[PDB]
Design a protein around this ligand. Sequence first.
Ligand SMILES: CSC[C@H]1O[C@@H](n2cnc3c(N)ncnc32)[C@H](O)[C@@H]1O
Length: 173
Amino acid sequence: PQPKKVGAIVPTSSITAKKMASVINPHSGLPVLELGPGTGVITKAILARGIKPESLTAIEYSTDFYNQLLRSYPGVNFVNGDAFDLDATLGEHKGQMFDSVISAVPMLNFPMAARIKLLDELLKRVPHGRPVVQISYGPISPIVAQPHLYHIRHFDFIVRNIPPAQLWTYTRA
Ligand SMILES: CSC[C@H]1O[C@@H](n2cnc3c(N)ncnc32)[C@H](O)[C@@H]1O
């Protein structure tokens, strides 16, 4: 018989969210950047690390999701806009450094070239050696290797996610 809710249209599992947020160092004194907070399941896991709400910036394109997030997570710095346009959402880069970037934007909705460019820009805004972590569902990295720009590491696999979730980390080369 025919299954409903095909693909990834239900919120990410709390087990997946906890592993994504485990890359954070809550003692670095640097804020955290979240992309695509949606219903807030990863937001919650980030705050559970002890990140002050004002030190979490989260960029959400959906205005409906954004309005609900403001009411559900007081004090978090939510931004309503496009994560691929960091100049418009974060401002032109003038020195702000994030501890790490936690990304659940649906990479496969965008051309490969845009994904590469976004990753190269995010890695400018974290200290050399700190990570971007990204969730995806295929067997390979949602962003193809460019070894002169970044290094790709497989981070974890969560079979109880619907559908099963791959986590990848990226650091500057
Ligand atoms: C947690 S599911 C993916 C989430 O990321 C949001 N999103 C998708 N694309 C973008 C994007 N370019 N920038 C910011 N948020 C996005 C979507 O509205 C959804 O909430």
